Design a protein around this ligand. Sequence first.
Ligand SMILES: Cc1ccc(Oc2cccc(NC(=O)c3cc([N+](=O)[O-])ccc3C(=O)O)c2)cc1C
Ligand SMILES: Cc1ccc(Oc2cccc(NC(=O)c3cc([N+](=O)[O-])ccc3C(=O)O)c2)cc1C
Ligand SMILES: Cc1ccc(Oc2cccc(NC(=O)c3cc([N+](=O)[O-])ccc3C(=O)O)c2)cc1C
Ligand SMILES: Cc1ccc(Oc2cccc(NC(=O)c3cc([N+](=O)[O-])ccc3C(=O)O)c2)cc1C
Lengths: 222, 217
Amino acid sequence: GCRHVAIIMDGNGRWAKKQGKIRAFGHKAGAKSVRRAVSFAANNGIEALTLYAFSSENWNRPAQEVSALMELFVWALDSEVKSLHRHNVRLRIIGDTSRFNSRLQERIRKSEALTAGNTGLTLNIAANYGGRWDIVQGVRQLAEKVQQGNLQPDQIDEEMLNQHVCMHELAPVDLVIRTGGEHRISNFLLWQIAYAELYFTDVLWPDFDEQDFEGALNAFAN
Amino acid sequence: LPAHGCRHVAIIMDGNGRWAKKQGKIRAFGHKAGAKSVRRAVSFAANNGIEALTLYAFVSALMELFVWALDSEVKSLHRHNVRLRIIGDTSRFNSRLQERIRKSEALTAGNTGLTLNIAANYGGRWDIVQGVRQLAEKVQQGNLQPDQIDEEMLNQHVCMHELAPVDLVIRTGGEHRISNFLLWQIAYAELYFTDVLWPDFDEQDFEGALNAFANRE
Ligand SMILES: Cc1ccc(Oc2cccc(NC(=O)c3cc([N+](=O)[O-])ccc3C(=O)O)c2)cc1C
Ligand SMILES: Cc1ccc(Oc2cccc(NC(=O)c3cc([N+](=O)[O-])ccc3C(=O)O)c2)cc1C
Ligand SMILES: Cc1ccc(Oc2cccc(NC(=O)c3cc([N+](=O)[O-])ccc3C(=O)O)c2)cc1C
Ligand SMILES: Cc1ccc(Oc2cccc(NC(=O)c3cc([N+](=O)[O-])ccc3C(=O)O)c2)cc1C
């Protein structure tokens, strides 16, 4: 029954600190664990996987370093997309991408467009996504319609707003996993998690493996 | 601020029916035991410096209980200096039915102790949509530009925006879901799940959840 899993991937920083290593070491192992989770979901017929990695710690850096990290994100996408495409994965980015420069925005769009026809796992990667932002994005759309005289306030209902928030084309989120020990959603999905199972594990993201993913799926089944 | 650090606790009070079934009792017995656990939790929050306590379990049988009890329960809240509010779509209740909820709110509205919000016919998606409808009405009036709508603005139109943010959500009964209780308001809340059934959740269990919050925050 588990069709759409969303994961808050916390623990790369603490993992690297436990290893006596710099944060970048944690993030390289974090990216290995991303690849492993995507492969496990695609090999087990999960229809959609939505991954959230954001921590303000990682981004509270001088502007030079922030632009640098943005380039590394798109490099990471560019360096994986041919593999994802060969495995029939549809890649989507959710979030506010208006902060990327034109060149990186076009690179993100190109990877989405390459894989958009694919019919296997849909992999949604959050980049500057917040659950309150996602709702507000939809609200501004409906507000524009009201202003244009094409929609009456009375006509706005849950199904309408749902069609304007991220991921409304996909199966509803069944299961949210958060690694790393904290027991909070931290303004990841909100509208979309109204009926999802919430599974919290103390395992740090770089250590979360196929066995840990199957235990999450068992909590759902139970 | 109390040592536990929690200003506003919200509780999904599940487990009343299972508690009655385990004992070979019919559901009404679980509801009566669940109501005693609600009074006990209200009293504990009032006594432990919590500013606001928001309770969900809200059906037909509990609605019949709601209408009955209401008067006697409000008199006891009033005597404990509790300010009562009902959140949710109360338009569904008949006009005599709405008047009584209204008189209870009015009676306690000057109370300076705990604010107790009882979520009745409430859903987290409904709460967001009613706030959206308020913004849409202001847009239609030409009072509000779509590009002025931001998170802070929508926050000021959802239930309980004038109380402290929800710090802690407790769900009893063993399930690990929010079940369309508060959604927008729990974006940053600590979530605490316990297998204890609601009629058995007592002051020590509430103290446990507060101290877990204090230590994890
Ligand atoms: C190549 C690459 C490698 C790592 C990248 O970045 C990741 C990837 C997976 C997981 C994480 N995860 C965290 O950095 C992380 C997330 C949360 N969180 O989402 O609430 C909290 C803490 C941390 C933390 O480890 O300090 C961060 C991002 C890229 C593009
Ligand atoms: C192969 C691979 C490896 C590591 C990956 O690591 C992730 C996974 C999920 C989300 C993110 N996402 C960001 O790293 C991310 C990047 C930018 N950015 O570059 O301006 C901004 C925000 C975020 C953000 O919200 O986390 C990064 C993602 C992939 C697809
Ligand atoms: C006004 C008010 C205030 C607090 C109230 O607090 C209670 C008291 C007794 C029982 C319940 N609540 C349930 O018994 C209850 C309701 C539903 N429900 O809506 O599906 C589901 C499960 C239970 C369950 O605990 O099994 C909730 C009930 C009411 C009517
Ligand atoms: C603050 C507040 C507001 C409304 C509330 O509304 C309910 C909800 C569920 C149950 C009850 N009330 C009983 O279930 C109940 C029934 C019988 N009975 O029918 O034999 C006797 C005593 C009680 C009793 O002590 O509560 C009352 C309960 C509370 C605690």
